[PDB]
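Researcher: Let's try something more involved. This one mixes different molecule types, so please make sure each is placed in the same coordinate frame as the others.
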Amino acid sequence: YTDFENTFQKTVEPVYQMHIKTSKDIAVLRSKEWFQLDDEDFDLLNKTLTFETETEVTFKNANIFSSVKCFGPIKVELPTKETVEIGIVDYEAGASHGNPVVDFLKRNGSTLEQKVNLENPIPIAVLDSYTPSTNEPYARV
Amino acid sequence: PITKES
Amino acid sequence: LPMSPNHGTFGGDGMYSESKLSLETLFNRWHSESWANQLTVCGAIIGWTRGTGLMSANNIIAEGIEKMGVRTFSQKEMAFNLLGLLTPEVVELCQKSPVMADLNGGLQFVPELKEFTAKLRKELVETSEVRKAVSIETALEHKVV
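Model: All components are placed in one shared frame. Result:
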């Protein structure tokens, strides 16, 4: 298939956390045109930020995107550990080779993972099943 | 200017 | 005598201040003791001199200081000031009574100099490491897109 004009891809990106320690990290974040606070004078210092971003992408060919979008809320951890919306990501390119927003957060921040592995797996069972002789009864229902 | 006393 | 205006003002210099302050007893001991005929004391309160073994670290802030109508010195300048003290007029003056020369370029008139120095260093190391970071991130963004 070469009909790239009809392809597209929505992705929900994994939640990313950034600990803002220094006025350097604030200055890098204020550099990024896509980092958009609701109130520009918000004190980001010592705050923990989460980025919940969806990426939409159209294609031009196998590897070059004809259009990128990376939008989503930016939340700040309160002292109760409850996250509250204080801004948005709002990246919007044309012909790109990558999502720079994700690449920024991959390096500077850390992936919040909902799934936590146990120390060792716990076997439950090893069970036999049979597939039926005919596929009509499943096809009927 | 800073060396000027009173 | 190479005296200092730093009398524990900057701190973290060991016993430098204790050494320099102590030299100032020679101005009184010249009158009191019995060596006035063999030695003359000519104290030279040397100011901020750029490029030396003791003050090479502190050169970047020197432009900052000079914008308070204060004077930092090159080594040739400070030498020239000190060679002024071996001219025949100041030599005839040291033999009458001890001579205290202030070559401090008005640096005593800056109030709370250690803070003002730390504030000048921090506004410069900051503006460096920020611009270094913003440039290396704007390169990594450009290269991904």
